[PDB]
Amino acid sequence: SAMFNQVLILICTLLCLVFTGTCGIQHLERAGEKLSLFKSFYFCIVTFSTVGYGDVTPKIWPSQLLVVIMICVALVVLPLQFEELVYLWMERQK
Amino acid sequence: KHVVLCVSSLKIDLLMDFLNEFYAHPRLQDYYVVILCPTEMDIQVRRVLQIPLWSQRVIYLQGSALKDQDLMRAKMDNGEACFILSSRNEVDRTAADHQTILRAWAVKDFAPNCPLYVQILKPENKFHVKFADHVVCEEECKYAMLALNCVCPATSTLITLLVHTSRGQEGQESPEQWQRMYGRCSGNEVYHIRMGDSKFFMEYEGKSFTYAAFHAHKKYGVCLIGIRREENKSILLNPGPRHIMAASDTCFYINITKEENSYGFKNKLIIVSAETAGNGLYNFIVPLRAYYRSRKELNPIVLLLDNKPEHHFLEAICCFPMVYYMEGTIDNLDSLLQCGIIYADNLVVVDKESEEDYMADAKTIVNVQTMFRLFPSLSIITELTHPSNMRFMQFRAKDSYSLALSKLEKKERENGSNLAFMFRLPFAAGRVFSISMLDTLLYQSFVKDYMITITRLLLGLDTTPGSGYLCAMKITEDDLWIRTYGRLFQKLCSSSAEIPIGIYRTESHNTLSYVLINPPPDTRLELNDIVYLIRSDPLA
Numbered sequence: 001s002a003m004f005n006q007v008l009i010l011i012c013t014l015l016c017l018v019f020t021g022t023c024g025i026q027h028l029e030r031a032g033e034k035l036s037l038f039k040s041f042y043f044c045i046v047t048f049s050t051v052g053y054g055d056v057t058p059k060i061w062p063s064q065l066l067v068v069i070m071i072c073v074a075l076v077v078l079p080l081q082f083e084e085l086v087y088l089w090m091e092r093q094k
Numbered sequence: 095k096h097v098v099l100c101v102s103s104l105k106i107d108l109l110m111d112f113l114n115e116f117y118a119h120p121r122l123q124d125y126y127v128v129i130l131c132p133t134e135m136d137i138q139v140r141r142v143l144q145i146p147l148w149s150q151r152v153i154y155l156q157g158s159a160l161k162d163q164d165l166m167r168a169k170m171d172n173g174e175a176c177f178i179l180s181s182r183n184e185v186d187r188t189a190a191d192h193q194t195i196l197r198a199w200a201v202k203d204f205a206p207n208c209p210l211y212v213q214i215l216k217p218e219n220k221f222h223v224k225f226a227d228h229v230v231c232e233e234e235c236k237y238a239m240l241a242l243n244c245v246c247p248a249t250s251t252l253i254t255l256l257v258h259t260s261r262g263q264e265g266q267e268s269p270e271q272w273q274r275m276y277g278r279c280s281g282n283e284v285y286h287i288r289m290g291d292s293k294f295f296m297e298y299e300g301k302s303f304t305y306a307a308f309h310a311h312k313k314y315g316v317c318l319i320g321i322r323r324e325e326n327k328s329i330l331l332n333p334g335p336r337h338i339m340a341a342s343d344t345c346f347y348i349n350i351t352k353e354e355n356s357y358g359f360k361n362k363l364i365i366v367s368a369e370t371a372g373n374g375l376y377n378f379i380v381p382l383r384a385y386y387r388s389r390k391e392l393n394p395i396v397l398l399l400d401n402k403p404e405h406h407f408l409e410a411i412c413c414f415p416m417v418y419y420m421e422g423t424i425d426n427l428d429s430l431l432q433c434g435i436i437y438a439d440n441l442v443v444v445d446k447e448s449e450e451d452y453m454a455d456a457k458t459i460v461n462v463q464t465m466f467r468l469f470p471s472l473s474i475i476t477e478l479t480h481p482s483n484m485r486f487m488q489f490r491a492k493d494s495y496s497l498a499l500s501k502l503e504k505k506e507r508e509n510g511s512n513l514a515f516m517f518r519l520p521f522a523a524g525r526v527f528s529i530s531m532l533d534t535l536l537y538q539s540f541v542k543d544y545m546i547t548i549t550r551l552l553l554g555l556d557t558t559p560g561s562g563y564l565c566a567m568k569i570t571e572d573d574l575w576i577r578t579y580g581r582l583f584q585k586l587c588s589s590s591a592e593i594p595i596g597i598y599r600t601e602s603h604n605t606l607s608y609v610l611i612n613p614p615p616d617t618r619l620e621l622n623d624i625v626y627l628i629r630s631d632p633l634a
Contacts, residue, residue: 002088002091003088003089003092005088006081006084006085006087006088007085009081009084010081010082010084010085013077013081014048017044017048017070017074017077018041018044018045018048020070021040021041021043021044021047021070022037022040022041022044024040024066024067024070025039025040025043025044025067026040028058028060028062028063028066029058029060029063032059032060032063033056033059035056039056043056043067047067047070047071047074048074048078095124095125095126095174096125096126096128096153096168096169096172096173096174097125097126097127097128097173097174097175097177098128098130098168098170098173098175098176098177099112099127099128099129099130099177099178099179100129100130100131100159100176100177100178100179100197100201101129101130101131101178101179101180101181102131102132102180102181102190102193103131103133103181104129104131104135104136104139105136105139105451106138106139106142106451107451107480107481107482107530108179108182108530108533109139109142110142111481111530111533111534112537113127113148113152114511114512115259115512115534115537115538116537117151118259118512119259119541121541122540122541124151125151125174125175126151126152126153127151127152127153128153128155128168128173129152129153129154129155130155130157130158130159130164130168131156131157132156132157132158134156135154155167155168159178159196159197159200159201160196160197160200162204165200165201165204170201170204170205170208171205171207171208173208174208175208175209175211175540176201176205176208176209176210176211177211177212177536177537178194178197178198178201178210178211178212178213179194179212179213180193180194180212180213180214180215182479182529182530183448183451183454183479184448185448187215187216188216190215191214191215191216191219194212194213194214195214195219195222195223197212198210198212198223198226202225202226209227209228209540210226210227210228211226211227211228211229211536211539211540212226212228212229212230213229213230213232213533213536214229214230214231214232215232215233216232216233216372216373216374217231217233217234217372217373217374217376217377218372218373220234228536228539228543228546230532230533230535230536230546232529233372233373233374233377234374234377234555235532235549235550235553235555236374236444236477236529237374237375237377237378237444238377238378238380238381238550238553238554238555239253239527239532239553240378240442240444240475240477240527241378241379241380241381241382241554242381242553242554242564243440243442243475243524244364244382244393244440244442245381245565245566246564246565246566246598246624246626247473247523247524247598247607247624248522248523248524248598248607248609249524250475250524250526250527251521251522251523251524251527251609252595252596252609252611252626253532253549253552254527254531254532255280255282255513255516255609255611256282256283256284256348256611257284257532257534257535257538257545257549258280258283258512258513258534259281259283259512259538260280260281260283260512260513261281262277262278262279262280262281262282262350263281263509263510263512264277264278264280264281264506264513264516264517265277265278265279265280265281266278267502267505267506269502272599272601272608273502273517275610275613275617276516276517276522276608276609276610277516277517279350279610279611279612279613280513280516280611281350281351282348282349282350282611282612283348283349283350283351284319284346284347284348284545284548285346285347285348285349285352285353286346286542286544287345287347287353287354288322288342288343288344288345289342290341290342291341292353292354293314293353293356294310294313294314294316294345294347294353295345295353296341297309297310297313298339299339299340299341300338300339301338301339302335302336302337302338302339303318303321303332303333303334303335303337303338303339304335304587304591306318306339307583307587307593308583308584308587310347311580311583311615312580314349314356315349315350315612315614315615316347316348316349316353317347317348317593317594317595317612318345318346318347318593319331319332319346319347319348319548319593319628320332320333320344320346320548321333321337321339321343321344321345321346322343322344322346323343323344324342324343324344328558328560329346329544329547329548329551329558330560330561330562331551331552331561331562331628331630332562332591332592332593332628332629332630333560333630334560334591334630334631334633334634335591346544346548348595348611348612349612350612357418358434359394359434359437360394361391361392361393361394362393362437362438362439362440363393363394363395363396363433363434363437363438363439364393364395364396364438364439364440364441364442365395365396365398365430365433365435365438365441365442366378366395366396366397366398366442366443366444367398367399367423367424367442367443367444367445368399368443368444368445369399369400369401369444369445369446370399370400370401370404371397371399371401371403371404371407372404372407373406373410375397375407375411376407376410376411377554377555379395379411379414379417380554380555381553381554382395383414383415383416384554384563385632386563386629386631386632392415392416393439394416394417394418395416395417396417396418396419396420396433396438397417397418397419397420398420398421398422398423398424398429398433399421400421400422400423402421403419420432420433423445423461424443424461424462424465425461435469439473440473440474440475441465441472441473441474441475442474442475443458443461443462443474443475443476443477444477445457445458445461445477446458446479451480452480452482452483454479455478455479455480455483458476458477458478459478459483459486459487462474462476462487463487463488466488470604471604473525474525475524475525475526475527476525476526476527477527477528477529478526478528478529479528479529479530480528480530481515481528481530481531482515484515484518484520484521484526484528485499485503485515485518485519485520485521487520487525487526488519488520488525493603494603495519495603495606496519499517499518499519502517503515503517503518519606519607522607522608522609523606523607524607524609535549552564559632559633560630560633561630561632562628562629562630563628563629563630564626564627564628565592565627565628565629566624566625566626566627567624567625567627568622568623568624569619569620569621569622569623569624569625570621571621573619574619574621576619577618578615578616578617578618578619579594579597579613579614579615579616579617579618579619580615580616582594582615582619583615586627590629591629591630591631592627592628592629593627593628594625594626594627595611595612595625595626595627595628596609596610596611596612596613596625596626597609597610597613597617597619597623597624597625597626598623598624598625599620599623600620600622600623
């Protein structure tokens with residue numbers, strides 16, 4: 001089942017990115033302005049959902065960039081997998 | 095609960111009528127219908143799989159019968175039924191056969207438990223799968239039916255409507271008188287009761303075969319046919335007046351509903367055309383001059399083909415008396431005149447040509463139609479494939495009945511669709527008949543094992559020694575000594591052994607036609623009419 005396979009890849013990647021985001025915001029903002037993990041989950045899923053509320057964001061030199069870098073990579077990485085998911089839907093139709 | 099069906103080329107037709115036919119059974123409906131084909135779905139048929147009802151009751155998959163992988167894919171072992179089918183319209187008649195029989199092996203191999211159902215075009219090849227559960231043999235039956243059409247009229251329509259299930263849904267339209275009665279008796283059908291007793295079985299345990307069908311018409315209106323002894327499981331048609339019934343013995347009977355639920359010449363001549371001779375026509379001719387048939391009334395028969403008669407045909411037919419060769423198609427007035435179509439009576443044509451689908455039946459419609467106008471005193475018969483095109487046959491510039499039939503047939507196909515094709519003029523005249531109409535027989539067979547065998551014995555074809563012939567008798571002015579159909583039945587079988595089934599009628603607008611199957615035995619009879627009776631006296 002390829003449909004299944006890429007569904008998995010999507011989920012895996014999402015999970016990975018969420019994890020990287022939690023782990024990303026965890027050690028940094030924990031210094032200057034302390035934030036709970038749920039705030040991170042929020043931010044991550046707020047970034048990959050393309051929402052961007054902005055209640056709390058990075059105020060620090062590296063902190064923004066790191067989030068940014070992860071997004072930029074994600075924004076390339078995001079469609080790769082959606083693109084993938086599309087390819088199978090085309091195979092299923094065939 | 096997975097049912098299997100396999101075919102080389104699907105088309106709206108075969109599918110449709112299968113489906114519509116298959117879920118007609120209340121008992122077995124829920125099943126996963128499995129389709130196996132090599133080629134992709136067309137843009138039309140792939141549309142009928144998308145409809146809200148047939149979506150999840152129909153599984154379609156792409157693949158063949160030979161590879162073992164795709165057989166697995168269908169879950170055969172689990173599956174409760176296996177159907178193989180043959181394409182009708184093809185370039186080569188002899189190749190299709192190979193395709194099918196082959197499939198048979200592979201399926202039998204894979205799972206030698208499940209029942210197996212299949213079609214076979216040429217008679218010659220019948221011999222190869224004798225091992226299978228049930229097999230429908232095309233040509234033999236085709237030529238047979240049409241052959242018996244030359245003794246009594248509308249042999250065809252009778253049998254067809256027998257093997258088609260209906261509730262009498264179609265008799266309540268009350269447009270007119272006849273049709274009201276005509277359709278009413280359509281839903282009429284054959285059924286199975288043997289065991290124990292029931293509303294009809296006990297009435298006579300100890301009296302003869304005959305006395306049964308007398309008083310069956312009195313209470314219910316059921317009329318039995320034949321009794322399988324429990325011994326050899328051989329089916330009989332109209333066992334003689336000597337045979338008796340038991341408490342455990344088989345009753346086959348007809349009713350509208352199941353028992354539980356309630357060179358110059360002499361005589362008229364006939365002329366046949368076909369594309370090629372084959373072991374096909376050997377069996378065309380059997381019923382014509384049989385044993386039971388007299389040497390007075392024989393109908394010498396002329397064979398008109400396109401291609402010169404092949405060698406085997408000659409050794410095969412030289413036995414019989416009375417036939418000849420003439421050549422050419424039905425085009426030339428002259429090619430037909432040499433034979434004496436004028437002296438002759440009934441016309442027989444079975445032909446075909448190897449884009450759009452129904453269309454391929456054209457080549458014949460045409461050649462025929464001319465004849466309708468050349469000889470208004472003449473009677474002809476015909477074979478199409480697509481059971482849509484029927485009414486497109488004998489048509490006149492102006493007819494009120496013939497045209498006003500259109501609205502009536504639509505008005506049937508929209509309520510629920512089993513037989514849309516009954517009411518049409520020529521069809522009920524027997525001048526028309528088709529191939530895939532008996533195909534229904536096969537589908538329906540899955541629920542009834544006595545459905546196929548019964549048929550052949552009716553025609554000709556299979557005779558195990560105890561048996562009977564289907565004959566007809568015209569009605570005339572001394573028979574009018576009888577009032578009606580019931581008063582008839584009881585004065586009929588008190589002399590010889592014969593059972594009626596249906597009748598035949600004619601009125602004016604030459605003239606119109608009817609068939610009424612197992613009519614209530616209260617119904618009257620005109621001067622020109624015909625009835626279908628079974629007579630067995632080969633053996634004492």
